Amino acid sequence: ESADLRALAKHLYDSYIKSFPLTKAKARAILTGKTTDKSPFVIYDMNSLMMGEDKIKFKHITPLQEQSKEVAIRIFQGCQFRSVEAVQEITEYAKSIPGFVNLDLNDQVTLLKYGVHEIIYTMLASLMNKDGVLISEGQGFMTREFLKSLRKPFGDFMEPKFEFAVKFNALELDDSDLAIFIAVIILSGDRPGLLNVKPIEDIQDNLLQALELQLKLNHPESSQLFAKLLQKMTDLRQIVTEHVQLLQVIKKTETDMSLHPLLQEIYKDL
Amino acid sequence: ESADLRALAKHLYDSYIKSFPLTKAKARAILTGKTTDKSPFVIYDMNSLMMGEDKIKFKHITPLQEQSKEVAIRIFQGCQFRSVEAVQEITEYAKSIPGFVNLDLNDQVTLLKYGVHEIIYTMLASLMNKDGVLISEGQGFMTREFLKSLRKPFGDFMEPKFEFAVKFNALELDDSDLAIFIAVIILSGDRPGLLNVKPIEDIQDNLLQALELQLKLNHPESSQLFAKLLQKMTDLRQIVTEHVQLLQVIKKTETDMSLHPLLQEIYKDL
Numbered sequence: 001e002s003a004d005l006r007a008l009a010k011h012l013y014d015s016y017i018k019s020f021p022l023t024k025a026k027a028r029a030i031l032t033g034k035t036t037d038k039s040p041f042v043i044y045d046m047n048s049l050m051m052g053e054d055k056i057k058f059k060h061i062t063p064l065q066e067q068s069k070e071v072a073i074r075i076f077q078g079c080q081f082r083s084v085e086a087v088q089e090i091t092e093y094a095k096s097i098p099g100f101v102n103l104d105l106n107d108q109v110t111l112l113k114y115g116v117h118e119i120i121y122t123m124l125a126s127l128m129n130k131d132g133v134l135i136s137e138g139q140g141f142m143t144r145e146f147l148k149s150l151r152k153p154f155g156d157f158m159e160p161k162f163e164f165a166v167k168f169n170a171l172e173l174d175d176s177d178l179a180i181f182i183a184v185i186i187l188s189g190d191r192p193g194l195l196n197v198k199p200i201e202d203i204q205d206n207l208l209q210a211l212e213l214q215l216k217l218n219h220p221e222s223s224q225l226f227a228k229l230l231q232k233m234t235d236l237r238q239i240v241t242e243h244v245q246l247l248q249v250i251k252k253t254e255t256d257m258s259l260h261p262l263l264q265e266i267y268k269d270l
Numbered sequence: 271e272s273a274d275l276r277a278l279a280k281h282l283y284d285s286y287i288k289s290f291p292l293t294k295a296k297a298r299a300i301l302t303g304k305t306t307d308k309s310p311f312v313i314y315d316m317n318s319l320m321m322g323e324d325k326i327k328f329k330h331i332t333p334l335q336e337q338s339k340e341v342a343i344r345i346f347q348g349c350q351f352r353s354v355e356a357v358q359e360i361t362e363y364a365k366s367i368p369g370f371v372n373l374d375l376n377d378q379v380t381l382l383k384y385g386v387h388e389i390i391y392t393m394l395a396s397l398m399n400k401d402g403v404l405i406s407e408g409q410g411f412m413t414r415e416f417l418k419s420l421r422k423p424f425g426d427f428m429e430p431k432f433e434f435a436v437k438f439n440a441l442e443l444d445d446s447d448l449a450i451f452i453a454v455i456i457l458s459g460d461r462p463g464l465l466n467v468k469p470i471e472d473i474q475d476n477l478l479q480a481l482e483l484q485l486k487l488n489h490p491e492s493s494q495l496f497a498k499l500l501q502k503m504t505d506l507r508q509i510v511t512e513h514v515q516l517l518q519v520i521k522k523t524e525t526d527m528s529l530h531p532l533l534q535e536i537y538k539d540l
């Protein structure tokens with residue numbers, strides 16, 4: 001019954017709104033302007049970066065950074081904090097996916113461990129355009145060029161995310177679509193170490209039926225969007241793995257920079 | 271209409287049968303299954319290799335193990351020889367996909383360059399089971415144990431394929447399904463260096479529509495088979511990436527000596 005699939009779609013969309021503070025709808029409204037209510041301050045260099053901690057609420061350093069927690073690292077631990085935060089949000093969203101909390105605890109943990117980062121990059125695309133990315137709840141916007149101008153290692157941490165974002169955004173998905181897609185990503189019965197794969201795939205199949213119907217009704221004129229979106233699932237994997245390696249480089253060149261335990265545990269990955 | 275889609279499907283199936291030596295239906299009959307007659311020669315150890323190598327359609331080297339071209343190397347070369355053949359067979363199959371030859375010539379070469387490995391591992395599964403892989407037109411069978419028992423470098427060359435195969439085969443696809451799938455793989459669109467992506471994605475869209483109808487008519491009881499198969503592309507991509515990795519290592523294993531020239535040409539890296 002397509003009626004049950006539509007109900008599942010509403011339910012997941014409802015929990016998504018309740019779980020994530022910055023939706024794509026709000027992100028796009030901020031990025032496309034035509035507003036005076038929520039224009040973001042733009043960080044495109046050191047100066048604007050310095051001033052940035054004056055317009056928005058940031059817990060870092062405004063002045064010089066060379067001999068005092070450099071700008072790169074300063075911005076790195078910023079993402080680190082937001083990431084750890086996105087993990088708790090995604091975890092809260094996961095619990096709302098029918099059947100998720102009824103699964104083996106070890107598997108719930110495993111699904112989150114391998115799914116969180118893939119969800120993070122998928123949603124991060126909502127905050128991006130070819131020129132940059134929204135930061136701190138959308139009050140700021142950090143230019144793509146500025147990020148690429150960071151120190152050797154950090155300078156290329158985001159470039160691959162932008163490349164993925166521009167392609168992914170071309171699909172023109174809205175929040176109601178992403179809510180089901182994100183749920184599909186989580187219930188991947190092919191994650192390493194899964195104990196009971198069958199119950200997991202039974203849920204994903206239900207979610208896939210919901211996603212398919214949702215895309216057919218929401219994008220009547222977009223042929224094979226469903227297949228096209230599912231293929232994007234391969235780009236995420238690449239992003240994640242790619243991210244992991246670079247992370248290993250940081251650890252060796254920045255033995256003074258710390259990583260949050262949570263994030264550190266989720267990698268043992270890949 | 272569902273008429274052009276069934277025609278497309280039939281067309282690819284025919285071409286697929288004509289282009290490849292052993293069909294999955296055939297390989298299955300031979301593998302786990304009686305079909306008691308002309309049982310394949312089994313390679314399970316060094317001695318069994320030597321015997322088969324001298325008692326089977328082989329064209330390369332002879333069984334000589336004594337500080338010269340170790341066993342593992344001889345097996346590796348055998349896989350390469352068959353791979354060079356598979357490349358030509360996949361190239362012909364590609365030319366039969368409607369619209370393929372009509373694409374920019376450079377794009378055709380690009381699509382084959384990046385899709386051959388994905389296709390090889392995908393079709394390889396048709397010849398694999400959890401205990402081994404059919405070799406030499408199915409005239410042989412090389413056990414999983416034997417392959418894994420090989421040295422540190424070559425021993426972890428086929429195991430990841432076995433794991434992939436095991437999962438992939440659980441989908442119970444047949445030759446008519448795989449024929450369309452392989453075509454989807456070839457008409458990607460995200461291959462680097464492409465010059466005119468539009469016609470490529472337009473063909474894949476047509477191929478995906480044909481694949482979906484095919485799976486729905488051929489596996490009416492298999493819910494969301496289409497979606498599950500598409501997500502398997504994320505597995506292949508990883509396998510392939512991981513494959514060039516071990517390949518780069520072999521390069522740093524065998525190189526020097528004025529022997530093997532022109533042969534290195536025929537192969538290079540594929």
Ligand SMILES: CCCCCCCN(CCc1ccc(O[C@@](C)(CC)C(=O)O)cc1)c1nc2ccccc2o1
Pocket residue numbers: 020076077078079080081082083086089090119120121123124135136247263
């Ligand atoms: C799915 C629920 C909503 C999630 C919102 C995620 C916001 N985010 C995503 C992009 C990102 C950038 C950097 C990341 O790197 C790390 C190593 C964290 C330092 C990681 O998460 O593994 C990870 C993720 C991100 N947040 C920020 C803030 C400032 C600059 C860059 C940046 O990137």
